[PDB]
Symmetry: D2
Subunit: 313 residues, 4 copies
Amino acid sequence: NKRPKISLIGSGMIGGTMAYLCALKELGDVVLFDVVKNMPQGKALDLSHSTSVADTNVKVTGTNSYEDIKGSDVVIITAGLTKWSRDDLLPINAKIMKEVGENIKKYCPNAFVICITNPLDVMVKVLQEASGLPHNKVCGMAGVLDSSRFRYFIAEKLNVSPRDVQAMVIGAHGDNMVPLPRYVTVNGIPLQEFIKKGWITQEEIDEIVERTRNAGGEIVNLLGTGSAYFAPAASAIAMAEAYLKDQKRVLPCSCYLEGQYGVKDLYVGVPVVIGGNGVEKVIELELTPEEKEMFDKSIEEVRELVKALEALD
Amino acid sequence: QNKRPKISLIGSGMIGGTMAYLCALKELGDVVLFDVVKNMPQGKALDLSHSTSVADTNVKVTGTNSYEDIKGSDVVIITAGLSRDDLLPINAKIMKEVGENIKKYCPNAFVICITNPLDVMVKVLQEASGLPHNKVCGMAGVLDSSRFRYFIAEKLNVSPRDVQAMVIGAHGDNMVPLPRYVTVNGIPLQEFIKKGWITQEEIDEIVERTRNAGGEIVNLLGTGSAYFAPAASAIAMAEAYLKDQKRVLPCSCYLEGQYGVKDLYVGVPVVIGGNGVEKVIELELTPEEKEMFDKSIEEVRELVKALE
Amino acid sequence: QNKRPKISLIGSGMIGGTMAYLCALKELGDVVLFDVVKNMPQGKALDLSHSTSVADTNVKVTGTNSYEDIKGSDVVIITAGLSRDDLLPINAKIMKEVGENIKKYCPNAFVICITNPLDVMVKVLQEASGLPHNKVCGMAGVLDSSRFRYFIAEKLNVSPRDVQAMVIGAHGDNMVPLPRYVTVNGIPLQEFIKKGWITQEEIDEIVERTRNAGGEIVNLLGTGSAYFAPAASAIAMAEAYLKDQKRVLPCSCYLEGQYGVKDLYVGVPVVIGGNGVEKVIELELTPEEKEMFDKSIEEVRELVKALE
Amino acid sequence: NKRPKISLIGSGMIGGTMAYLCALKELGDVVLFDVVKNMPQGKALDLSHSTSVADTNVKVTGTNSYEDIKGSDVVIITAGLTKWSRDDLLPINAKIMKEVGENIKKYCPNAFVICITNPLDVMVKVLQEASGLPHNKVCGMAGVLDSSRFRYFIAEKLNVSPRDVQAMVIGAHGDNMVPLPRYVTVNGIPLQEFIKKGWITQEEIDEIVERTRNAGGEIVNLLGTGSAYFAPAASAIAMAEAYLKDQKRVLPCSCYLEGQYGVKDLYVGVPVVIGGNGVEKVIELELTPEEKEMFDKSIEEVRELVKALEALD
C-alpha cells in the first residue's frame, strides 16, 4: 500500500503553513513545490525536524520539478502573484495556472485539486480546462475562508464558540462576495432571535457583513508585509481533509455549476458537500429576490473576466 | 504548587469507566473513579493507567471507595444510582448522600448529573449539595440531540458536524425534539424537504426514533444500556467548562422564570463556560412547541413535589 | 470510487467495543463489529454511531452477525473466543472458522489476533487463513510492555512516553520482560539505580508485577478482564499499519530462523508499517535472557504440536 | 476561573508559528507581543479567523505594550537579532533580554519563562537575573531542537519512526553542542546493535552527529532568507505543554546547575524533567571521560561569554 500524497504547488507562507498542518494531522506524504530554487527544500527539512517533536514519521519533501507531484491524491495551488484589485491579476495568473494544469494532467490526473490563486473563480476554470480533470475534482478555496471570518466576528460579539456559529459566504471571492446574514444561526437558532433578546443589533450585523468583505485588506494593512496565511491555509486543509477522509462536510467552495442558481458552465462559490469523490453535491439555497440579485451580480463579474480572458489568445 | 485539574466520577459503571477513558485520552486532568463496590474501581483505574503508556500520556487515574478522595475536584460527574417509580426514593437518597459529600469535600466543583429521572435527581442533588445553581446541571439534551443529529445526518448523507439539532424539556418519553430548528450548516431543514433530500414523513419518524433511542439500544444489547454516547456527552460538557469553550449545549439547568418555569431544572439550550452554566438561551418557541415543553415539565414538577 | 479504510472487529465483547470506539475517535476508518451473538453488536454500533455526533465525526459503524460484511477489510482484529487446556480445542476451532472466512472475504487484510493462548492461536489462525505470514500477527507484547512501562514510570515519576521497556517471548506466565533494555529517553535504567531514583529490588518486583498484571486486574474487578489497555494496544498496531508509521513494537510474529526459532509465532520486537510486519529485530540477548526466551517457547511448541 | 495565558515576546516567524500551535492544541489564551507596530495585531486577527476552521474559541491578541502580558502562565521569548557567529550577538541581545526580564518581573512574575534568543545559555542567565524569578522557572530551548534533528536523521537512515528513536544533545547551543551517540537507542535498544546487524555504519553515525551540529546553517543556506522556525517553535511548545499539563517529560534544556556535572551557578543544556512546577529535576548522565571533556569545553565557552558580559557595564 501507499500513503496519501499531498502536493502543494507554491511553497510560500500559505503553502508552508498547509504543509505543517498536513504534518501535524498525519494526512499523508507532503511535497512542497516552488519555482524558487532550494527554498522548498529548506522548509521541508525544517518540517521533517518538527516531525520528531510531534512523534510522527510524516515524509515532507521539497522540490523545484513538477515530476515529484506524480501520484498526488490532493493538489493545492498557491502559485501566482498576490500583491485596481485582484481581478487585474487575471493575465499573469491565468498563464501560471495553465502551466500548473498541464503538469497535473501529465503527472497526477487522479488528484483532487484545490485552487487558492486569484481571481479564484476564473483560475479554477482555467485549471480545469488545462488539466482535463473532471469538473468535480477541481474546486477553489474562498468561501470557507470568508465564512470563517464571518463566523468569528459573529461569535466574538455573542461570546459563544465559533463552533456553534453557522454562517456562509457565497459568490465570487473579492468585494462582490455575498455574505448571507439571513442564514446565520447559533446551533440552528436563527440569529434574528438574538437581536430580539438583545445580544446583537441589526446594525452590528450589518457592519460585520462589511468587515467580512474587507477582512483580507484589514490584515494586509496591519501586517505591513504580505497577506493572511493562517486562516487561508487552514481553510484549504479542511477541504483537503474532507476529501481524504470522506467526511461529507458542507462547505462553501468555488465549484462547477450546471444549471443551479440559473448558472451554466461556470465555477462560482456555493455551498457544496465535499467527500471521498470530490464535489459530490451542490446545495441550491432558497435565495430571496434581493439575495439572488447580489449573487447574480457576482456571477456577471466572473462571466465578464472569462470573456476578458476569452479575447486574449 | 501548580496542580492539574481533578475530575471525580461518582459511579464507576459502564458510563463511569468510559468517561474515565475519554478524560485520559484527551488529557483533561487527573481522574478519580469512585464507587461503593470494593476494588472494582481500583481495577479499572489500573487498566486505564496501563492505557496511558500506549497513549504516551502522563494521566493519573485512581480508583477509590472513599468520598474523601474527591476533595478539590474541579468537575464531578455522577452516575451513582440503581415499577420505575419504585426506584425514585432509592435514587433520591443516593443523590442526597452524594450532594452532602460534594458539599464537604469539593464545594467549588462543577457538577454534572446523569442519574435518572434526570431532571428530578439533579434538583435533589443541587439541594443536598448547597452549591450555586449555575454550578450543578444534568446531562441529557446533549445525548438526545446527538441521536437526533445522527439520524438526520445519515438520511441526508452529510457529516453530523454539519447538522444542528436540539432536544429540550425533560429527559424521557416526553422529551421535545425541535424539528423546526434543525439546520444543515444553518440552512433550514425545510429547504432539504423541498429539494427532495428528505420527506417530512421521515422527519416525523426521526423525532420519534430519537424519543425511543435509549430503549432501542437496550433491546438490541440484551443486557445493559447505552454508554458510549452518554459518556461522550457528559465529557463534552466537562470539557466546555474545563477549557472555557462557551459551547451552546442543551442541558438540564435551573430556571428562574425563563420559559415560564421557576425553581426547577429542565433541559434548555445554554452556554457552558469556565464559570459553569453561564447563559440560558430562551428560544422563541411556537404555541405548539411551548405546549409540549410545558407538558414535559408537569411530570417533573409532580415527582419533585411528591418526593418533597 | 475512493473508499475509506475498513476495520472489521471479529468479536464484539468489552475489548471489541472499546476498540471500535477508539477507531471512531481517531477516525481511522469504517468499523464493522462482528459477533455470533444476535443483535448485541448492532446495538453497540448504534450507541457508537450516536457518539460520532458528539465527536463531530462522520465515522461509519455497523454491527453484524454475518461474516460476509467483513469483505474488503484492510484490518481485522480478532477477540472471538471463550482447566485452561480445556479451552484449547474450542478456541482452535473458532480460529479455523475465522481464518476460513478471512480467506474468503478479505484475503488482503492485516490481521491482528488477541485470543489466548495468543502465540498458539495466531499460529492456528494464520494456517487456516492462508494469508502471508507478514500479514498475520498477535497482540501481546505491546500490552505487556505498556504495563512494564507504566510501573517504571510511576516509580521514577516520569512520563510513560519517556520510558522504553519491552516484553518478549510468549504471552503468559513465562513472558520475558527485559529489565536490561529499559531506558529513560535512552538513558540506561541502571544509571537511575546508581543515582537513587530506584532500587534493583524494586525493578525485580516490577518485572513480576508485569508478569501477573492481567490476573491482578481480574482479582480487583471481581467480574471480567482488562480491556482498556488491551484495546489500545491492538489499535496502536492497527494505526501503525494503516498510516505506515514504522513503529518498533513487540508483537507475536512468525520467525523463520531468528532467535533460533523456525515456523513459530512468538513475541519479538518488530517494525510495523504499511506492508505489515516489515522487519524482525534480532536483539543481542545474553545467555540468561536467551534461556528465558527459549523456555518461553517450549510451552508454545508443545501446544502447537499437540493440537496438530 | 481563568484560562492559561501564554505570552510570546517576539511575533516573528517562530513566534507566529508558536501561537498557531497554541491555538490548535487549545493550550490557552495567546498574546503576541512585538516592537513592530500593528504587525502582531495582524497575525492575531488571522489566527483568530483560523479558530473558526478548527472549531475552537481560543483567544489570540496582538500588542505592542508589555502590560498585556500581565498574568501570563508561560512566556516564550524570541526577541532579539538572529542574523563570527551567534555568540557575537551577546551585547545587543543581552540588553533586549534585560528589558524583557524587567517587564516579566513587573507584569507576570509567576510565569514559566522559555528563552530561545541566542547566545541561548547566556541569555537565560541574563533573563533570570533581570526578572528575579526562581531559577527553576527560567530555562532555554535548545536541546529539544538539536535532539529533534539528531532523532530525525537517525530515524530516516534506519527507516523507523522518530517516535522510537531516543537521542540527546547537551551542552551549549551552537557549534560547541555535544550530541551523545552512545546514548542513542531504538525503543531502548542500543544503536550499537544496529551497527552489528548492518542497519547503519559507525561512519554514518559520525556524519549524522556533524550534520546535527550544522543543521541550523544547512537550513539557512537552503532557505535564502531567514532561519528555521517550524522545528524551533514546536520544540518550545513541547516544553511549554510539559509545564502546563504537568507531563513530567524528560527533555534536554538549558537549565540552572548547582553542582551537577561539576558546574556551579550556570545555565547549560542538560537532560531535565519538566513538570507543573517548572524544571523539577536535573538528570546527571554518567558521561565517559571523553564526553565529559566535550561537555566541559562547552561550559568554558559559556563561562567566558558571561565574563565578557561581566566587563561590559
